[PDB]
Amino acid sequence: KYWLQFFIPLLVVILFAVDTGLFISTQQQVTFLLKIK
């Protein structure tokens, strides 16, 4: 009824969570990439 102004932070927090998951994934990916001589 009045708590409607709460879902927008709920969306952005999970967006940032999956975003940082992708970030650490690509971090590990580039760490593997730089293992080059």
Binding site: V12, D19, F23, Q27
Partner: peptide
């Protein structure tokens, strides 16, 4: 509510800075 945005606001700042570091160290490599 008013303070709720404060916790997540510097989250973006630290992610942007860490992205800058990642970009500089991929351009180095």
């Amino acid at each position: 509510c008013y303070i709720l945005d404060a916790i997540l606001f510097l989250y973006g700042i630290v992610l942007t800075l860490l992205y800058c570091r990642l970009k500089i160290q991929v351009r180095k490599a």
